[PDB]
Amino acid sequence: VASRVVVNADRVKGTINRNIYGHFSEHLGRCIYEGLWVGEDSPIPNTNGIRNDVLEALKQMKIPVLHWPGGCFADEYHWKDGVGPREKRKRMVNTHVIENNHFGTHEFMMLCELLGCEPYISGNVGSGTVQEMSEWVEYITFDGESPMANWRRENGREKPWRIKYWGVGNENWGCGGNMRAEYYADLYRQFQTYLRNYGDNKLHKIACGANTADYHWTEVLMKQAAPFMHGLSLHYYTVPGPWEKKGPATGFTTDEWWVTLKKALFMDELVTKHSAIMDVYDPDKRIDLIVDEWGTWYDVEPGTNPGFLYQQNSIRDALVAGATLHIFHRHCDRVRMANIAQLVNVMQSVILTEGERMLLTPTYHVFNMFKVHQDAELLDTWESVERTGPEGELPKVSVSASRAADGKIHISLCNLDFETGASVDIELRGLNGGVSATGTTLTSGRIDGHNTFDEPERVKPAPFRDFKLEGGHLNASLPPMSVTVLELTAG
Amino acid sequence: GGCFADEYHWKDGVGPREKRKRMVNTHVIENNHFGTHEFMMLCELLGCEPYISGNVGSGTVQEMSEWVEYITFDGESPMANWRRENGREKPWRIKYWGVGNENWGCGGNMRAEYYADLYRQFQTYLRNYGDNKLHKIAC
Amino acid sequence: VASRVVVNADRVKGTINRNIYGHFSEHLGRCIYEGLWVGEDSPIPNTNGIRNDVLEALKQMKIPVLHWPGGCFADEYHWKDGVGPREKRKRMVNTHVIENNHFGTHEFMMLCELLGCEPYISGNVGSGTVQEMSEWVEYITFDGESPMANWRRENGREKPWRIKYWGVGNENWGCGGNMRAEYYADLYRQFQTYLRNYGDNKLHKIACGANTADYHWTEVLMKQAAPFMHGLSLHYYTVPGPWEKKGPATGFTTDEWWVTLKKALFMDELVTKHSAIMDVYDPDKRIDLIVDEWGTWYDVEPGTNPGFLYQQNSIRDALVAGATLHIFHRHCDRVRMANIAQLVNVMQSVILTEGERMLLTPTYHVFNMFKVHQDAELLDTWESVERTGPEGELPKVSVSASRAADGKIHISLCNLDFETGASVDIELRGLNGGVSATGTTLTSGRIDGHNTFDEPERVKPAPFRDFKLEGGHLNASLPPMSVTVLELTAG
Numbered sequence A, C: 001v002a003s004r005v006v007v008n009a010d011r012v013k014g015t016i017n018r019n020i021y022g023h024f025s026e027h028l029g030r031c032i033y034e035g036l037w038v039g040e041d042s043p044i045p046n047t048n049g050i051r052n053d054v055l056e057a058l059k060q061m062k063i064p065v066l067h068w069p070g071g072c073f074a075d076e077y078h079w080k081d082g083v084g085p086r087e088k089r090k091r092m093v094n095t096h097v098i099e100n101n102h103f104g105t106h107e108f109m110m111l112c113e114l115l116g117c118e119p120y121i122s123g124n125v126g127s128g129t130v131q132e133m134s135e136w137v138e139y140i141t142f143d144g145e146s147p148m149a150n151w152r153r154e155n156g157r158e159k160p161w162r163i164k165y166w167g168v169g170n171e172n173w174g175c176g177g178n179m180r181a182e183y184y185a186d187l188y189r190q191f192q193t194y195l196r197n198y199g200d201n202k203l204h205k206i207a208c209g210a211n212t213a214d215y216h217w218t219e220v221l222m223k224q225a226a227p228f229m230h231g232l233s234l235h236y237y238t239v240p241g242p243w244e245k246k247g248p249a250t251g252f253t254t255d256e257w258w259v260t261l262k263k264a265l266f267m268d269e270l271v272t273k274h275s276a277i278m279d280v281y282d283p284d285k286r287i288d289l290i291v292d293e294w295g296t297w298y299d300v301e302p303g304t305n306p307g308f309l310y311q312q313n314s315i316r317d318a319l320v321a322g323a324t325l326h327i328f329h330r331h332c333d334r335v336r337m338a339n340i341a342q343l344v345n346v347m348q349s350v351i352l353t354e355g356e357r358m359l360l361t362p363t364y365h366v367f368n369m370f371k372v373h374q375d376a377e378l379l380d381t382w383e384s385v386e387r388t389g390p391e392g393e394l395p396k397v398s399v400s401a402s403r404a405a406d407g408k409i410h411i412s413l414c415n416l417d418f419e420t421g422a423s424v425d426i427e428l429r430g431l432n433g434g435v436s437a438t439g440t441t442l443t444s445g446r447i448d449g450h451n452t453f454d455e456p457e458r459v460k461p462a463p464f465r466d467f468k469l470e471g472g473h474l475n476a477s478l479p480p481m482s483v484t485v486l487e488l489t490a491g
Numbered sequence B: 001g002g003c004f005a006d007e008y009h010w011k012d013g014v015g016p017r018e019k020r021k022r023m024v025n026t027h028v029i030e031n032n033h034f035g036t037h038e039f040m041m042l043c044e045l046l047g048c049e050p051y052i053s054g055n056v057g058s059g060t061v062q063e064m065s066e067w068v069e070y071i072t073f074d075g076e077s078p079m080a081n082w083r084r085e086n087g088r089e090k091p092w093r094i095k096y097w098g099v100g101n102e103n104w105g106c107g108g109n110m111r112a113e114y115y116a117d118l119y120r121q122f123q124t125y126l127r128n129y130g131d132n133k134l135h136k137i138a139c
């Protein structure tokens, strides 16, 4: 009983926008402070205050876009508190957490330039003013003379920055103001009016979209505000248990494995149904769907502060990431950005740090393996896959194929069963020449296999050779609980 | 304005003329040398009524309320004291007061129903000081 | 410059419900009287009062479903007027048109049995009562004792008939009561409640849907009445000129050719957008979309009564029909019935009669050539086609492929350009064996080529041989202004 797949290598169905592989960093826990920002005089080796070990790993992963500063923090942030001389930045210290605002606009834009990624900034609607947000944009982007542009120059950046992605509030249905969609849509329309295109900059204005299955939100924002947006967001976290006892990152049950993956795959139905509503108001698909919060959310590691959201990261997280990325690919006609929550030390991170030490999570390795899909052409594939899990409720395999700019084909495959391997037969159609293939696979011997600071390489990619290629068929034996990428070269 | 009215912040146009806000776009210069005092003088020289449009789209309720108070109040307050420091001892009279302009478009892309609510809110705080009587105009 | 197509012969995309090839006959002009019903002692040869020449032609075409009695007539009809001793039924005559009610329920049900087609009756909401409609269903379908079933037996039909398709009013936004969607939805819910399933009969209840681009109607009916319907209708006529001067059926300009075809192809946008709204409320596509009025609508033939809607029928009509049917195929995941307006002597008919004489229109020949698509499996095809018309506004070629129950493949092609032939290269993938092909084509030497009673065979199907099949490519040279079907057999 093999899964079967046919790849039509000559039929392109869309472009997988690189920003599908995006990231998110809030001022929360150790995502910004320690995770990225250590300060110029830290003994952790750093580039202008940003730790080198993280920088180098994120560059290798080819981070395309980074969303900052929030999350809920964005609708509480007053950007002027984060610019100017470090010693006059606003300082808050709670003894029950330090926000010293040493990382602000200039440090973020420096971060993005060091990474080679797009900045994606969210302005403050819930507790901010229209002038405040307008002034932020002007500060960043205006090349003339004004109090804001002159301030930016004073603070060390002479020429403006370019920025496309601009979020007009975040989570406005909840921590960003507990707003009705109808009320948010009016604020949105008002705020966005004053966010200008200065110089040769072109803003890509993103309205706050729904939480999970709040389809009414999407309908209202589309019906009332479509002509005034370039994108609409969507938030959906994979939470295995109930809110008050989400379940652990490691040491979990087999039931928790299956439930986690089933909940992750619910993304497909969400994206489908929100997109269907968007199609009614925007049939040409002008407006991007932006899934700017996704990923797993567990109970924090025992003994850690629940407010810091620190969780471990296992092969289970790798499967969530790979299957979710595949869902985004299948919707790349409308989904054009996604941002996993969150970059470092918080929720489903690519990196965890502990002082000067760091590790790469299994989530990191999926992003780094799947980077070959960034800006690739999605190929037409059809499939008939085995089932797995209790009552066959899950697909055993998730597969996606794309063509890179040099003509190579990448086929990525997830085996969602932790107990046995998956046989897959792939037929390749529409090739001219012959092809050869190499592979890499990410797997584990344990259902909760993970990396630690003492053992940072327990779960990492390896060469994959358990396949054969002949007569236009590639037959592969995928390991249990694995993510695999095959690279095909023509000739 | 026009569209400028829902972008203007009136405080930028008062005070020592030399130290007012400057903006320049290469791609147009606004030095704010013509502001509230200069406009009110202009209307007095012409013998015409002044008709000012306050900023709803990017302005705040306090900001508009303070504009009216600055112009018209004859007592002691931070705004009236500031007007006197800026060279006008007694208040001016003004009737015609626009509570935003072009709010369906360049003044905030507002639905009528939403503008009506902001209108009701903003106008509440535009007071009749001394013997002045405002004539409030909705967009 | 060939159009190119690839057929994936092993990939099925859906089932083309046979009812896509449906028809519609209203009590209007000579559609029912003379067109079908001649009376038992007419010198026109007949079977139980229905003319044999039409019967035989419709059976050969494999008519799958016939909608009666309207149109606007349905929301004026009182069915009890059409049952009982034929001689004593209601008579109306307008001098300023005769309705003797000799064709009523028994005659219609007999007609469908003789044809082997499903009956599709529209009940009267606009001027009818809930009891009246409920009694109609009971009269037709109930096998016990009751006043209605006893009456049917007295009128000569002992056992009940079966009927699936039941329209709960027609054109209720216009001639069926000038209703707002919200008000119609409420009447719909009320009327349908009383339409019972008697014996082993199962009704398929159809709500009146939108006229043309009235998307609000579809939204309201889906949101308020989806759980109470099996199907929702849609109406769209191709009208070349303005309402008051639509343009003629023959002797038209080349501009009228292009405008006609462009307007016809607007069906795709309509069906797409109405279907998108349906998907929001019915994501599993339970509810059928029924396009129960479509076709061309011209000024009547000079000197004929405008109220009788008699128009000629040319190769231009054949192209409208073939391109429209192809649009329905591409939407066969949701469109499950369609009904061209109207069957005989009215609008875009398959047959025109003049006393005992009859002719087959070019529209007939499309339906008869495309019957091979009835209940077939739609195959995955992709294409890149030449453009035609002023400014390349039209596709030069429309193509569709399906697989019949015996494994043959039919590929139909329309060439929309009247000026030159169309080269097409078709690649066949996913076959095992070799294949051979035969073809038929329908074309004319004039842009308004048509059949007349004196020359009833000027435009009719002919063998098509101008193609070659080698090395899994079928290259064809389609004639100008043509509709062609290729039949492929494996081995």
Ligand SMILES: OC[C@@H]1O[C@@H](O)[C@H](O)[C@H]1O
Pocket: A026, A028, A070, A071, A072, A073, A171, A293, A341
């Ligand atoms: O502050 C914790 C918040 O909870 C979640 O809804 C958000 O993603 C995060 O900003």
Ligand SMILES: OC[C@@H]1O[C@@H](O)[C@H](O)[C@H]1O
Pocket: B001, B002, B003, B004, B102, B106
């Ligand atoms: O400012 C440009 C604007 O165009 C028009 O809508 C307004 O009057 C004017 O202020």
Ligand SMILES: OC[C@@H]1O[C@@H](O)[C@H](O)[C@H]1O
Pocket: C026, C028, C070, C071, C072, C073, C171, C175, C293
């Ligand atoms: O009856 C005349 C009407 O015109 C169209 O609206 C309807 O199909 C037809 O019944």
